[PDB]
Design a protein around this ligand. Sequence first.
Ligand SMILES: CC(C)CCC[C@@H](C)[C@H]1CC[C@H]2[C@@H]3CC=C4C[C@@H](O)CC[C@]4(C)[C@H]3CC[C@]12C
Ligand SMILES: CC(C)CCC[C@@H](C)[C@H]1CC[C@H]2[C@@H]3CC=C4C[C@@H](O)CC[C@]4(C)[C@H]3CC[C@]12C
Ligand SMILES: [K+]
Ligand SMILES: [K+]
Lengths: 267, 337
Amino acid sequence: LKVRKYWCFLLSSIFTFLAGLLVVLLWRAFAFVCTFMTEAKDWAGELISGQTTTGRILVVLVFILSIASLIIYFVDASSEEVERCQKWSNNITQQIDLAFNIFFMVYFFIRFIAASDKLWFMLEMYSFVDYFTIPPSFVSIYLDRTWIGLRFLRALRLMTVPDILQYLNVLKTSSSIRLAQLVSIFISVWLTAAGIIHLLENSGDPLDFDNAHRLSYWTCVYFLIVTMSTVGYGDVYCETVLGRTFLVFFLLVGLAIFASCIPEIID
Amino acid sequence: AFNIFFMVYFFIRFIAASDKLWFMLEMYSFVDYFTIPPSFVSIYLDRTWIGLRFLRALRLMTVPDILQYLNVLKTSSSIRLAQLVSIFISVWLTAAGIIHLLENSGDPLDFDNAHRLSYWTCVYFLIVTMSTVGYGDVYCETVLGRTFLVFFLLVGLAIFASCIPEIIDLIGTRAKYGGTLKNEKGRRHIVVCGHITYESVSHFLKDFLHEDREDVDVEVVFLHRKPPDLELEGLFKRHFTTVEFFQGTIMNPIDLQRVKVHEADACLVLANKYCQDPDAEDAANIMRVISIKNYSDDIRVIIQLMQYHNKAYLLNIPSWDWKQGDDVICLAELKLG
Ligand SMILES: CC(C)CCC[C@@H](C)[C@H]1CC[C@H]2[C@@H]3CC=C4C[C@@H](O)CC[C@]4(C)[C@H]3CC[C@]12C
Ligand SMILES: CC(C)CCC[C@@H](C)[C@H]1CC[C@H]2[C@@H]3CC=C4C[C@@H](O)CC[C@]4(C)[C@H]3CC[C@]12C
Ligand SMILES: [K+]
Ligand SMILES: [K+]
């Protein structure tokens, strides 16, 4: 605890994104000097879209585990400290987190096979969630320490709920589909923004981390809703430079996007 | 070194100005008045003051003019977006400089109530003020700072209310449907155009993909001008591995290349049976066949036809050959038959 090992978690996530990106380019370069893909890509297409009987099982199961994974983060965020040292067997939360991540890793591989374009699949917004969530876990299980990191990014998976419902033919009316999309976007952004504020405020300013503003995750949720509604009580506010820096950008695009969202939700 | 260039540039604009009196009162001219003459005071007075040098941020609103001079911006939306972005950023930075100067210097004639406040904290302060959030952690204490804040609240809030909503709107949503169909070895695909709605697509897909039919792998490509509604997008999602959609018109040769009509097995032109004017619907669909045949004559075309007397126009097309597979489905002829 004398020296923070947060860069080790960040370095692996950056390396995984960089290594995965160049391999696709390297494979294209390797394809210049150089079936299963005909069957697997078509087969994986129905698996992710829930067209086959086994495809719907995967679609429903990943829907449930996405909800359960976010709950695991909620109890994790309840910890007062940002970095903890503990063995894998000591805590059962880490074991269950590992159980959910291996499923999210094989599911990531399945979509990669079903992806028609490999370069854009790596650069899609969904893959960045996996890059900053899965590789951190193996680093934690290897170095034998845990860190809050960027674990709040699984809240971004809540915006695929309308896609899952449409795959199972649950939503049919256009109004119902539009309402579900807007609700998922508002909730996912609200929870993700709270996680960013919670991490930045608690960790403190980089490279010295002497100004740590103790702030509970649920208090951050109450802080964001006040900020979004332009109420600004001032009882809870950001003090760190990075906390204020992110708030400046959130006030620009977060309110602008939500300007046309709530009016078309109430009607 | 920068100011002597900004001084000769001021002289160049003075020569090019048709009217001299109105050139002296220009907003960009006042920026030169409070920037360069103070600079030559420092070289002589041997002391530096923050002063009003923050006015160089007002030069950011000349950025759209510079881009238009170089013919970089041509579209109206691109020009409008640059103008709104430059106006908002320059006002935001200039207002922060005014707050930073007034708060740090203190009230005139005593200068004993100075409030130590960083420039970047002022930048964070104005954006909170313009968003009408008002945390209250950072606020103005001097008389001048509050006086300028009162003036800013009247005009600065209007700038935020007009620029920010349009900036995101001008950027807009990405074109979800577009690009070129991916080429696959041994792939048999067809192109369906014409009346593409949730009514036509759902009935067509149920018939085309039926368990009682022969098991053949044929991808279906839909081309339409309007973006599909949420009902149609969900239908395409359930048929992701076999049904594909593109945005574009069949009469555009560029759009024909995107869907690869020349490699398509056949082209299907649906028709709007419940149309107000069958003559208009028939002839619009006839023009679609001409565009497809113009791109390549050796393409099988199947079209739905409302009235029979419009079949003569298609039969008179030099590239129309019934022996090669071209067929006309006449609704009136079959229904009355
Ligand atoms: C795909 C890449 C290029 C996007 C940019 C990389 C981003 C995700 C990386 C690079 C620098 C990283 C930051 C470096 C420093 C800090 C401060 C620490 O207290 C919390 C984590 C945080 C805030 C990191 C978050 C993730 C981060 C912003
Ligand atoms: C073209 C002319 C008539 C316009 C009005 C002249 C303006 C620009 C001049 C005249 C008086 C000047 C002010 C005199 C006193 C102060 C207080 C000092 O602490 C900050 C500068 C400030 C605020 C000056 C700003 C510039 C100023 C307001
Ligand atoms: K308001
Ligand atoms: K307020």
